[PDB]
């Protein structure tokens, strides 16, 4: 019976490792806090160095982004998200995230992503897909590669 | 200011038309009740004749299915959903819906779909995508084709 | 590890019992399909005889109501929900549901309720609260009272 | 037609004011980023000075808390949330938030609260309720009190 085990949890910053966004990039780091397989939701911190244009992605659900530090923007919009701002991406929209400056502080963002991230080509083809399964595979692959007993980010406990 | 206009609404069965799932099928009918563009959620009735195997789809979010009448199942699972049952599909999973019998009552289902439906080939390629945008395009295209003043399924009012 | 057990499930109409909405009413019946303790969501069928005014309730989240049969309405609104209609109640609103006629078919409704139902007095005081915990208590109390092995409505499997 | 206006938005830290959590406290500050009246969801930054025990509250939905700075905890749990941690509160649970130390850095937290916050007495009575309506009233009352043209936190645009 699952409800007997469900309760308010807390995962401290240094109880989940920072890890490279493999096999695509070694500079973009990610830290997984929650990976909900029922609704397909992930809660993460995402570190990225300055002056980096990232791939255009089509996202199926919503994305809440709180900028911890640094500045960034989408090539498709005329605004810049600074530290202390909140960006709310809506369903079935396309975005090309990138750094707001060629050099400066690294971009750290707290993200709550619902649904899958479908990465695209210039010719508009779907090349890669990131979801809770790919998030979990990466989290468990890094843990098993190192000597880290992995935590259950799937449950709410 | 949007909250001033937000309130509990009601769309009666004969205030939204039954329409073919164009341009793919003329036999599978759909009725749109809500098309949320923020979270990418649609509420619909979906009519389908007996003995029809539908395309395999990968779904990015959740799907709550209440069977109004008829019986159906997924080729990937060993159970059959009858009238009065509730099926709860979870994020990033693949399913091939089909009729539970070659002949009998038409399958009517009340569906609450969160996210996009990525239709696939036997070779596993993404061929078609259904989302709130494609749902809205179809709803507005049928209304404009006929003499129907379309309703705002985007707002909650 | 929870994600290893998460999958698309199906609960048939006669695999969850119809039960009175105890200890408040013996005429209003409820059937529980899902009782999510993480987000506080319940999926149910709710049967009610004609000509019955129910208590006014304040609801904290949303409610999607599909009318399977019968007709009903809220005293606070000028519309009537008939069979085949969809009603979408929005957050922090107050409603007094009641039958659209003094005599006629029993009202059966498919409901997806997110959050708690705070029942109120004429003097506007909170008297009763219905949530996933009270839903689960009732489901498990009826099952234990009878000889029914209860199902895990808490998990998505 | 609402979907025509829906798009990815961004509210910068200094485009929404820090304001006291009136009429209850002048020391606890709040900053509103989003106030969704459909699902009853609010996105906020919440500043609180060290060594402050806050009222016990029962919450109807979920709460995602990212600690920007400082340390805090719930009296009902044995863990402490530090800067860089993520706390996920689940539906229909009771918590007494408080500072992890009598003196030290002020507690700043990024919160995503779904549903209402029902504040309680020692005798367990519901005394106060905070929701999107009370959040909006406070946001609009402070703006009108000062010479601030208020932003539409209700829409996703």
Spell out the domains of chain B, with CATH numbers in brackets: 2-157 (2.60.120.10)
Chain D residues with beta carbon closer than 8 angstroms to that of B156? 38
- Is residue C125 within a helix (H) or strand (E), and if so which, with residue range? none
Please report residues of A whose CB lies closer than 8 A to that of D156.
88, 90
> Which tokens is B13 given?
């069965």
Whether residue A154 and residue C35 make contact (CB cut-off 8 A), yes or no, is: no
Residue C138 C-alpha, separation from nearest chain A C-alpha, in angstroms:
14
Backbone angles phi, psi at D6, to 5 degrees: -70, 130
Q: Which helix (H) or strand (E) holds D63?
A: strand D63-69
CB A150 within 8 A of CB A16: no
Q: Which residue has the tokens 């993460």?
A: A44
What is the distance in angstroms between the Cα of C151 and the nearest Cα belonging to chain A? 8
Using alpha carbons only, give the angle D124, D130, D135 rounded to the nearest 5 degrees: 170
Instruction: Give the torsion sign (CA, C74, C77, C80, C86).
Output: negative
User: Which one of C3, C4, C152 has the shortest CB-CB distance to A2?
Assistant: C152
| C91/D contact by beta carbon, under 8 A | yes
How far, in Å, CA of D62 to CA of B112, rounded?
21
Asked if A136 is an interface residue toward chain C (Cβ–Cβ < 8 A), one would say yes
CA–CA separation, B54 and B57 (whole Å): 9
Dist CA A108 CA A96 (whole Å): 17
What is the b/e burial string over C112-131, where b = at least 16 CB atoms within 10 angstroms of the residue's CB?
bbbbbbbbbeeeeeeeebbb
Shortest CB distance from C6 goes to which of A6, A38, A156? A38
Cross-chain Cβ contact D84/A45 below 8 Å: yes
Q: Are the Cβ atoms of B3 and D37 closer than 8 angstroms?
A: yes
- Inter-chain touch D6–B154, beta carbons under 8 Å: yes
Q: Give how far the C-alpha of residue B130 lies from the chain's centroid of Cα atoms, to the nearest Å.
A: 9
* Closest Cβ–Cβ partner in C10, C45, C86 for B34: C86
| Interchain contact, B60 vs A60, CB within 8 Å | yes
The C-alpha atoms of residue C101 and residue C51 are separated, in whole angstroms, by: 6
Looking at chain C, which subunits does it touch, using at least 3 CB pairs closer than 8 Å as the criterion? A, B, D
Q: Is B96 on the interface with C (CB under 8 A)?
A: no
Residue contact B60–A61, C-beta within 8 A:
yes
What residues does B88 pair with on adjacent strands? B64, C9
Among residues B72, B11, B70, the alpha carbon closest in space to that of B42 is found at B11
For D37, which of B6, B136, B154 is closest by C-beta distance?
A: B6
Q: Whole-angstrom distance between the N-terminal and C-terminal Cα of chain D?
A: 13
**What distances in angstroms separate CA B69 from CA B50, B107, C87, one per listed residue?**
11, 6, 20
According to the entry, how was the structure determined? X-ray
Chain B neighbors of A90, CB-CB under 8 A:
37-40
Question: Closest partner residue to C3 among A2, A4, A136, by Cβ?
Answer: A136
Instruction: Evaluate the omega torsion of the peptide bond into residue B23 and state whether it is cis, within 30 degrees of 0.
Output: yes
Largest Cα separation within chain B, whole Å, is 53
> Contact C85/B12, CB-based, under 8 Å?
yes
Q: Which among A25, A59, A67 is positioned nearest to A42, based on CA atoms?
A: A59
Residue A21 CA from chain centroid, whole number: 9
Tell if the CB–CB gap between C154 and A35 is shorter than 8 Å.
Answer: no
**Distance from D34 to chain C by nearest Cα, in Å?**
15
B-C CB pairs within 8 A amount to 88
From the CA of C36, how many Å to the nearest CA of chain D? 9
Using CA atoms, how far apart are residues C49 and C99, in angstroms rounded to an integer?
A: 8
For chain C, helix, strand, coil in percent to 5 are 15, 40, 45
Cα B88-B94-B98 angle, rounded to 5 deg: 75
Find out whether A144 and A49 touch, Cβ atoms under 8 Å.
no
> Which of D2, D35, D136 is the closest to B152 by Cβ?
D2
CA distance A93 to chain B (A): 10
The Cα–Cα gap between B42 and B116 comes to 10
Q: Give Cβ neighbours of residue C136 (< 8 Å, ≥ 6 apart).
A: A3, C35, C37, C153, C154
- For B62, the closest chain A residue by CA position comes to A39
- With CA atoms as reference, report the closest residue to B119 among B111, B129, B110: B129
CA distance A38 to C157: 9
Tell me, letter by letter, the H, E, C secondary structure of chain B. CHHHCCCCEEECHHHCCCEECCCCCCCCEEEEEEEECCCCEEEEEEEECCCCECCCEEECCCEEEEEEECCEEECCCCCCECCCCEEEECCCEEECEEECCCCCCCEEEEEEEECCEEEECCCCCEEEEECHHHHHHHHHHHHHHCCCCCCCCCCCC
C86 token code pair:
């969809």
Contacts of D119 (CB under 8 A, 6+ apart): D55, D56, D57, D126, D127, D128, D129, D130
Q: Which residues of B touch A114 (CB under 8 A)?
A: 39, 61
The whole-angstrom separation of Cα D38 and Cα B102 is: 42
Residue ranges in chain C assigned as alpha helix (H)? 132-145
* Subunits close to B (at least 3 CB pairs below 8 A): A, C, D
- Going by the DSSP 8-state scheme, the letter that residue D2 receives in this structure is G
| Contact between chains at D156 and A88 (C-beta distance less than 8 A) | yes
Contact B44, B33 (CB under 8 A): yes
CA distance C33 to C133: 14
Contacts of A132 in chain C (CB under 8 A): 3
Best residue of A3, A5, A8 to probe chain D, by most D CBs closer than 10 Å: A8
Which neighbouring-strand residues pair with B30?
A: B19, B46
- Burial category of C100 from C-beta neighbours within 10 Å (exposed 0-12, middle 13-18, buried 19 and up): middle
**Which of C24, C35, C55, C28 has the alpha carbon at shortest distance from C139?**
C35
Sign (positive or negative) of CA dihedral A147, A151, A153, A155: positive
- Residues of chain D with Cβ-Cβ distance to B38 below 8 Å are 6, 156
CA angle A17, A18, A19 (to 5 degrees): 105
DSSP state of C55: P
Look at C40 and D91 and tell me if their CB atoms are within 8 Å. yes
A-B contacts (CB, under 8 Å)? 73
B154:D37 CB<8 A: no
Distance CA B58, CA A131 (A): 12
Q: What is the CA radius of gyration of chain A?
A: 16
Alpha helices in chain D (DSSP H): 132-145
3-state secondary structure chain A: CHHHCCCCEEECHHHCCCEECCCCCCCCEEEEEEEECCCCEEEEEEEECCCCECCCEEECCCEEEEEEECCEEECCCCCCECCCCEEEECCCEEECEEECCCCCCCEEEEEEEECCEEEECCCCCEEEEECHHHHHHHHHHHHHHCCCCCCCCCCCC
CB-based contact, A22 to chain B, within 8 Å: no
Q: Before C118, cis peptide (omega within 30)? A: no
CA–CA dist C21, C43 (Å, integer) = 15
């Amino acid at each position: 019976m699952l409800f007997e085990s469900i309760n308010t949890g807390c995962l401290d910053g240094n109880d989940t490792p920072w890890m490279p966004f493999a096999p695509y990039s070694n500079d973009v780091m990610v830290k997984y806090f929650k990976i909900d397989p029922v609704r397909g939701e992930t809660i993460t911190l995402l570190k990225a160095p300055a002056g980096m244009e990232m791939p255009r992605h089509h996202h199926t659900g919503t994305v809440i982004v709180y900028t911890v530090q640094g500045s960034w923007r989408y090539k498709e919009h005329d605004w810049v998200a600074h530290a202390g701002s909140v960006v709310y991406e809506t369903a079935s929209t396309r975005h090309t995230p990138q750094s707001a400056y060629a050099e400066g502080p690294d971009i750290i963002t707290f993200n709550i992503v619902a649904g899958e991230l479908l990465y695209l080509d210039d010719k508009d083809n779907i090349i890669a897909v990131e979801n809770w399964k790919t998030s979990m595979d990466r989290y468990l692959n890094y843990c098993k590669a190192h000597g880290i007993r992995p935590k259950d980010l799937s449950t709410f406990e």
